[PDB]
């Protein structure tokens, strides 16, 4: 001139919801697919997840024992005071992350204890949690397949929108791309069943398979395509959703296995002094561990970004106008 | 070495190069307007003088810190390649020291640019009372100019011949070394430049008629002794034979001014091939050349602006 | 774990190698692309999405090895 | 397992190695090509079609390992 | 403990190879890319977050090995 | 579970190494040439056919493993 | 370890190799960042703190070897 | 007859390695020389026949493994 | 050896490898950083203080191999 | 059918190692030199005979193996 | 002379890999830094002492092996 | 003459490694030097002999393996 | 002398690695430093002695392998 | 004389490793230095004599393999 967590980034994606430039959709629905999962990325127990609470309390708050988190409500940092004031919006969105991450510490910790479902003690008396029980083939498997599912849906989210770019502009080229890749899905599912129950299908749909390959190729051949090979990589996208989700499990588990030597027991035959024997190494290692899961949460964004920045009914295509969306929804 | 560190340094540096439109813009300025325009770019942080020589100094100072540092980080293998480029600039300066030394002119008013060698190396070298003693000053880390000098120093201490042959010998050193590495691009840049330098050398001396061997440099790829000689006899027909090569425009160019202008453009195309090489030195090599071409444009256009000489008189010079 | 034959030792051993070899290949693949990219950022933000995109691609390799590990594991 | 058969164990091993080596190769193949690409893209959006075409050639290695692996299976 | 089942001894060894091979891949990956990052600090304090995130992606390789390690043994 | 004749395991192991090693060889082969390959394309759409011819000689390497695999297989 | 027999020895074998591979991976990872690193402090004295954060990270690979090693102990 | 002995397998394995390994070698050999070749056209149409001819020459090595394998086969 | 004991031979082979591999890693790490170092005295006498901090960090790798090795033998 | 004795199978193996390993070493000799040569031709047409001669010299090494292998045939 | 059981050979072998592998590590380390080193002497007499001290530092790896070998005997 | 047994099988094996290892060493030895020589050739026909004498000397390594192979032989 | 037993056969093997590995390590040490060195001589006949002594120093590694071989001999 | 005992094949294997490994070290050592060597001769014929001494120094590695092979006869 001259709920709150959900609404705040939603309000900024709205400005590009109102922009006319296609009949396709924008990445505004993105916020509920991302948000829970992002929190559920946090996984852990007594030595970890259930301690993430503290971290949060210094953000929307602070504690003045922290050399650079002095008075954060009035912002004082190793970067500017103004930035701190501006990212009050963020400090809360992180705090909410902390509130749910702690919660997924008990979500994780359901399958880490009890005599409700596992035939060993109600809470280990030294410290609760001493051995994470998921190493049973089945126990692990259900958590694996669970992760996959949120990803399969994400494959759907993109290709529908993608097909919509070519539908509503009459880009036969965009239509053909989206359609053929959904053909692609049919073949993946055939093979998978023949290993997933082993004998669940694989001849229910494994002889339908001869006809499934036919469902694929109908519109790829209509575009002709010169980069006909690229359909391998498209299969790589179905699998990628699985794979990232799989990692989300595995890396998670990896996080968990450190409490079994870092808080549970790893020194001495066994005593009631082991509690305070173990903290000498444990505490240092903790923050290194902490850092990496911050990296893990970028796996989501990348996962999304597989679809987002690569046109699946979206603007950004290896850049382009429209701006790193990660940075937008953060608030 | 690993070009990782280097590459990154160049990329930020690539951030302060201007767009075409700067150079386009500079043309309708006045000297005042120049002073302001210049003050807003990265060179501006050392612009604070008010006269033209002050601009020259600004360039000097800016380039001194932004390029003159780079081999010096460590003198790894990649760094060695870079070391050669900047070293060519020392060689000219070194030659300036030879003439200065020889008529003994109080050195202090001889002003040498910063290259890679330190200022104190020049001063001490001046205080080294002989070209042999001077070569020893150079000799300390092991320097290709040292070696070129050592090879030349045997035949005569005739200053002038020594300057010519020293340079000649220096590029001979560069040639072997450049051919000796994994930088197809450097091999090419040096090579085309050698050819171009010969071609120009031959062009410039038309009307002397001397024996070709005194002027034919080594490293060619499009210049052989016979063509070389032929042009030296004055035969321009030599120039129609490198059509279609990267030297295709050499048809009908019989003036030196135009000739160098074109040649300079060809080498510019070569610098652009090697773009963004984490592969190696292609990127740094390109950057250096670009900064010179920028520099050329700053100083000239500063002057053009300073004295208010017609726009059209100069326009060709930034036009490749 | 547990035990169940000569067979099990064989199926377990070679299985890892499938995964390991692919993983190693991915790391090298990732190293070259990974280095180049940082320079792209430096010059420009716009390519950054690309820089990310480059990185995504080698990681598929790892998983294919993992499928082989998976089937082999899936008899134990 | 659930019954022995050392013989089965050798095929189980080798199914993976075919897969691992090809993967390893794909990664090296991608790394040199990929790296060149980030600059290429930056310079030219136009060079991108090639960059994509380039990616296609490495994919072939994996397919073979798997092919041999598949043929082996349906016996295990 | 003691001397018994060859199968337990055999499997424990091969478990390491998956983990180790991936580790090797990560190391190479981190070294080039990681080095590229040091220049980044120099370039921009601002770009630094990218540099760190880039280094992170290779470590996932290691994690696949651990996952595989657990299934192989860790049930005794 | 299950067990097959003396023949299959030894031939199967060594069959894989043959394809894999050659495959790896192809990757390195592709990597140097391929990297070289892009600069010509970028400049010269016209020089491209020769660039295509350059890639072609390395392509034999996968095939050799397969040829030997056809005679071997069927003894399986 | 101690006085034992044949089963324990095999598991003992694989323990060293696991440890070695990560250790080696760390060294290569350290060598590239480290070499750059002495220069980085020099260029940017302010950046010395960055150098501190940087240096810690490769060492993590070895630590993974310990994690698998610790768990392995319990029969070793 | 699909089945046979361990003996046939012993000779078969080490024969294969010969085929895989040489092929791998051919690729590296091809890769440096191959790298030179694309440039060779650009500079010189005249060098193209030679460069192209050069590429063939390490390849004889590959043929030797196949020849030795063919003559050995048909006794097996 | 000396007297019987099945365990002892098995652990002994691998005892060398754990240490040997870490040592090899120490070397790669040192070669690059050390190389950076010789120049460092030249630029700055001062850089020696950085140099003291730098060198130690790779050395940690050897210490770990020996530590685990102590556990293998040094108990008997 | 057409099985052989214990003696023959092993010896055939060790014959191959000579042929493959050398094929790789020779390839390495040819790659650097071969590459150097194409540049020589471009510069110097006279030198072409030398360049041609240069490539010949490593290929002989494998051939020494083939001669010993030939002699093995007629017993093998 | 003397001979032993199956066990004895494994300790006899294994002593060497420890020393040798570490030795390999010392060499790679020394070679690069040393290579860098020589110019410093040339320029300045004063820098020589650090360089000299530097060379010892990787070599320490070998000393450990020799110790491991000394203790090993008496069981050999 | 005629067949023998188990002993022969091992000897063929180690023979290959001996020759092959030497061949690999030769390849590297010739490759760097062989390339370096050609530029000397370009300048001078006079120096060509030196280059020629140079190339041969590494080839001796293969010959040395073969000498050792003869001693192994005489039962081969 | 003559033939022997299985234990002795092991005792020869690792002994070869002790000498060979140390030699190999010495070779890398010689290669990098050896390449650097010559210029000092070239300039100065006088400087040769330091260079000579420097190159001499890594070679001690090799004697250690022989020392291990000597102590062992009369036990094979 | 023919054949031999069970033992002999094992010693035969390891004789090769001793020799081969040193040879391999020699090849790399000689290659880098050899490459450095050639330019001096061209410039100065006189300097060939220093260069000549230089190449010689790595050759001792080859000799060590022959010496260990000589002493071994006494078991073969």
Residue numbers in the entry:
A (entry chain N): 302 to 303, 323 to 651
B (entry chain M): 3 to 322
C (entry chain Z), D (entry chain O), E (entry chain Y), F (entry chain P), G (entry chain X), H (entry chain Q), ...: 5 to 80
Text taken from the publication that reported this structure:
The V/A ATPase from the thermophilic eubacterium Thermus thermophilus (Tth) is one of the best characterized rotary ATPases. The a-subunit is connected to the A3B3 stator in the V1 domain by two peripheral EG stalks which form a peripheral stator apparatus (A3B3E2G2a1). In addition, the dodecamer c ring composed of two transmembrane α-helices, the d-subunit and the DF shaft constitute the central rotor complex (D1F1d1c12), which rotates relative to the surrounding stator apparatus. The proton motive force generated by respiratory complexes drives proton translocation through a proton pathway made up of both the a-subunit and the c12 ring.
After refinements, 57.9 % of the particles corresponded to state1 and gave maps at a resolution of 5.0 Å, higher than those of state2 at 6.7 Å resolution and state3 at 7.5 Å, containing 15.2% and 6.3% of the particles, respectively. Local resolution analysis by Resmap22 for state1 showed a range of resolution from ~ 4 Å in the V1 region to ~ 5 Å in the Vo domain, indicating conformational heterogeneity within the complex. Local resolution of the hydrophobic region, especially of the c12 ring, was limited to ~ 6 Å due to conformational heterogeneity even within the most populated state1 structure. In order to improve resolution of the Vo domain, we employed the focused classification by using signal subtraction of hydrophilic region for state1, as described in Supplementary Figure 3. The improved map of state1 at 5.0 Å resolution allowed us to build a model of the whole complex. The inclined α-helices a-TM7 and a-TM8 are intimately associated with the c12 ring composed of 12 c-subunits, each with two transmembrane α-helices joined by a short loop on the cytoplasmic side. The tilted a-TM7 contains the conserved R563, corresponding to R735 in the yeast enzyme, which together with E63 in the c-subunit forms an essential feature of proton translocation. The density for a-TM7, where the R563 is located, is in close proximity to the center of an outer helix of the c-subunit. The cytoplasmic cavity provides direct access to the hydrophilic residues on a-TM7, reaching the Arg-Glu pair between a-TM7 and the outer helix of c-subunit, suggesting that this cavity corresponds to the cytoplasmic half channel. The periplasmic cavity in the center of micelle shell faces the helix bundle composed of a-TM1, a-TM2, and a-TM3, including a line of hydrophilic residues, and connects to the aqueous hole giving an access to the inclined helices.
